């Protein structure tokens, strides 16, 4: 497998380190998303260890709501990940248009996200660290796919701690902003911010300027719009506790504490995993090359890496 094994069809995203393209594999007629990074750029921007981390996490993980990796391969100038294509686009795309999701619909995505993160933490010893609307896509049937594993921490067993200042500023957990060592409960802060955006239509702490935004995160309690039901409020309150020791999910039971919360009383977690629950929204695509759920700005448009290469 090389660049010649594929046809390049549409640009889906492009973000400094490289690009994402909808491709078709010549041998099979199957469509994939190809993340194509320039080696030069990755090396120059210091993105090498993040690339290997994403490569290991993707190779090691198999879960219905995590993007599956088919191939990794390199050229002289490129590193390429060929991944399952999520034809439904980013949650960021949908919520930008719809403003808010109903509690039921936010619940469905929350449960799938919880199922994936419980898997990462408990089976794989990985903390994801960058949960956000942009890294949450919908597949052709309407199920969540988590994308973009470059910021993961690996080898994190139970409550063990980490130190890297990383993530996305609007989603950073207070213990991270405190410059404290922190554990996998940061993932449940991220879930809380995502759940908050879905049900409330805005970030719970907001300033365009990252540093003013950091002051709100550390100081202010979240506001609760009067339309939020009591189980929703309790869940958001719990996941956005600023002390991770008091956070929902912040103890030894990790995701099992969130799964038991009354906001999720309707949900049968084994059926979430088995994909037996009807998605609230099915992407209405005509074709497979139909990129209606991707932004028009896009779709209209040197070392050897030892043992990078992979096939599933």
């Amino acid at each position: 497998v090389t660049m010649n094994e594929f046809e390049y069809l549409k640009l889906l995203g492009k973000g400094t380190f490289g690009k994402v393209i909808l491709v078709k594999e010549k041998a099979t007629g199957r469509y994939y998303a190809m993340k194509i990074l320039k080696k030069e750029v990755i090396v120059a921007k210091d993105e090498v260890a993040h690339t290997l981390t994403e490569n290991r996490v993707l190779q090691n993980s198999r879960h219905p709501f995590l993007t599956a990796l088919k191939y990794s391969f390199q050229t002289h100038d490129r590193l390429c990940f060929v991944m399952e294509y999520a034809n439904g686009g980013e949650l960021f795309f949908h919520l930008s248009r719809e403003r808010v999701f109903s509690e039921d619909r936010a619940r469905f995505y929350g449960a799938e996200i919880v199922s994936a993160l419980d898997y990462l933490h408990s089976e794989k010893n990985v903390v994801y660290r960058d949960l956000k609307l942009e890294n949450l896509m919908l597949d052709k049937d309407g199920h969540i796919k988590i994308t973009d594993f470059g910021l993961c921490k690996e080898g994190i067993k139970d409550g063990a701690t980490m130190k890297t200042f990383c993530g996305t500023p609007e989603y950073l957990a207070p213990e991270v902003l405190e410059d404290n060592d922190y554990g996998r409960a940061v993932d449940w802060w991220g879930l809380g911010v995502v759940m908050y955006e879905m049900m409330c239509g805005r970030l719970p702490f907001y300033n365009q300027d990252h540093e003013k935004l950091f002051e709100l995160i550390l100081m202010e309690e979240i506001r609760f719009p009067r339309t939020l039901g009591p189980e929703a409020k309790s869940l958001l309150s719990g996941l956005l506790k600023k002390d991770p020791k008091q956070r929902l999910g912040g103890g030894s039971e990790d995701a099992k504490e969130i799964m038991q919360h009354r906001f999720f009383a309707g949900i049968v977690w084994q059926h979430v995993y088995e994909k037996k629950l009807s998605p609230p929204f099915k992407p209405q695509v005509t074709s497979e090359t139909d990129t209606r759920y991707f932004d028009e700005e896009f779709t209209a448009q040197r070392p050897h890496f030892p043992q990078f290469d992979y096939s599933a």
Binding site: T164, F165, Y171
Partner: peptide
Amino acid sequence: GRPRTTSFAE
């Protein structure tokens, strides 16, 4: 709708 955010690592 908020602007797209950017991931980072220090």
